[PDB]
Amino acid sequence: AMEKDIKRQIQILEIITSEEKWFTTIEISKILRCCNKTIMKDISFIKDFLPEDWHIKIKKGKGVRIYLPKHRNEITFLLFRESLTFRILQHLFERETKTIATLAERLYIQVPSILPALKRVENYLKKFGLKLRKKPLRLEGDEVRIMIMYLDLYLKSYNDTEWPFEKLKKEVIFQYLGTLEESLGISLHVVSKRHLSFFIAILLKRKQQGYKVQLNRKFLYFNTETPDYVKIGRIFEKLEREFGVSLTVQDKILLTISIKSSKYVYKD
Numbered sequence: 399a400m401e402k403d404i405k406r407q408i409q410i411l412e413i414i415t416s417e418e419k420w421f422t423t424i425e426i427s428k429i430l431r432c433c434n435k436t437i438m439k440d441i442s443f444i445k446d447f448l449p450e451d452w453h454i455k456i457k458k459g460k461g462v463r464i465y466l467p468k469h470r471n472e473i474t475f476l477l478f479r480e481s482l483t484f485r486i487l488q489h490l491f492e493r494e495t496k497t498i499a500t501l502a503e504r505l506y507i508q509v510p511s512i513l514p515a516l517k518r519v520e521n522y523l524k525k526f527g528l529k530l531r532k533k534p535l536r537l538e539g540d541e542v543r544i545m546i547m548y549l550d551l552y553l554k555s556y557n558d559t560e561w562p563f564e565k566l567k568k569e570v571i572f573q574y575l576g577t578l579e580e581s582l583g584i585s586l587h588v589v590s591k592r593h594l595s596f597f598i599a600i601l602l603k604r605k606q607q608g609y610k611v612q613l614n615r616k617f618l619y620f621n622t623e624t625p626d627y628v629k630i631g632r633i634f635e636k637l638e639r640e641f642g643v644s645l646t647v648q649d650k651i652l653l654t655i656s657i658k659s660s661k662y663v664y665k666d
Contacts, residue, residue, distance in 0.1 A: 400432050403554045404475050407444050410437065411473055414454070414464045422461035443554060446522040447481040450511060478555035479562075482507070482515035483522060487551060490519075493607045495534035523547065541604070541611050542652065548600050549593065558592055563599040571595045574637060578657065581629045583665045590660035597656055598637075605643040613648050620651050627654045 399405045413429055414421050427434040441462055445454040451467045478484055485505055489496065496504070502512045520530050526547040528539035537544055552562055561568040575591055578584075586594070601611075621627070631650050638645050645653075 400430055402558060403440075404478065404557055406430070406433060406436075407440055407478070407554065408473060408475055410440055411444060411464075411477075414462055415466065415473065418463075420457070420460045420463045425461070442525075443522075446518045447478045447483050447555070449477070450482065450514065475557060482512070483518045484551065484555055486512075486515060486519050487522075487548075490530075490535065490537045491548065491603070491607075493609070495536050497534060498532065501535060522551075526550070541609050542613070544609075545597065545600050545604065545611075549597055552596050552600070553593065558589075563596075563603070566599050566602065568595070570640070571598055574598065574633060577633050577636075578630065579662075579665075581633060582626060582657075584662040585665055587661035590662060594656060594660060598653070601649065601653070602637075602641050602643065605645075605649075606641070611646065611648045611652055613651060617651055617655075622647060622651070626658070627651070630654050630657065 400409070409430060410426060413426055423434060423437045426437050430437075433440075438456075441454060441456065448454065453465045455463050455465065457463070482505070486501065489501060489504065498512060498516075499509060502509045505512070516530065516532075523530055523537070523539075526539070526543050528537060528543055528547055530536070531538050556562050572591070572595060575586065575594060579586060627650065630653060631645075634645050634650060634653065637643075
């Protein structure tokens with residue numbers, strides 16, 4: 399089970415909540431029987447997506463420890479999407495800004511309670527080179543980095559069977575991917591399809607909000623005649639029409655690089 403991010407995150411939480419004491423990565427690795435190299439990374443994701451009054455502490459030469467308050471609710475995969483951190487980041491997805499006071503009211507929480515949550519949001523954003531400005535509240539940074547942050551957030555907060563996007567049919571997106579595998583003669587790994595379907599959903603939703611992909615100085619010499627880019631561009635024309643957006647060359651290169659970065663085999 400431990401290759402599934404959300405499952406591994408929950409098992410780590412179950413371990414460090416089992417006793418009021420410090421846990422070393424060795425100790426955790428022993429129980430997971432894998433994944434020694436990713437435990438601290440998982441811990442740094444998890445700590446941002448906790449209930450309000452749960453606190454993880456990291457201490458050199460001690461390891462990790464979690465401090466809990468109250469009636470203890472069952473730890474489930476739902477914890478991530480239920481956190482204040484997630485729910486705030488979902489509101490920041492869209493262009494329409496709020497004040498903190500508005501945001502608090504829409505989340506059904508008191509303003510005092512949102513101030514710590516904002517600091518957890520800022521901490522997660524920091525890892526993607528992103529920032530939060532407050533007057534008004536808005537995500538700030540390179541558009542592509544924003545998409546990567548949302549990709550990470552959705553992949554780690556949902557089971558690999560779930561489809562979190564509204565107003566967007568999974569079967570449609572998977573049809574595009576099916577057409578791409580046919581056109582290129584490849585078979586995408588099931589994980590790569592998940593990443594790509596999420597990334598496309600995210601791109602579609604940001605484009606619908608008006609945001610613009612801008613690539614680094616490098617790729618403005620990308621070969622837009624390379625054969626695989628030529629078919630990718632053609633399949634995505636169907637998408638523009640169907641979702642009512644316009645894909646720039648920036649978009650098509652991004653999507654092409656995403657596909658080329660994926661895991662797949664050639665078909666015969």
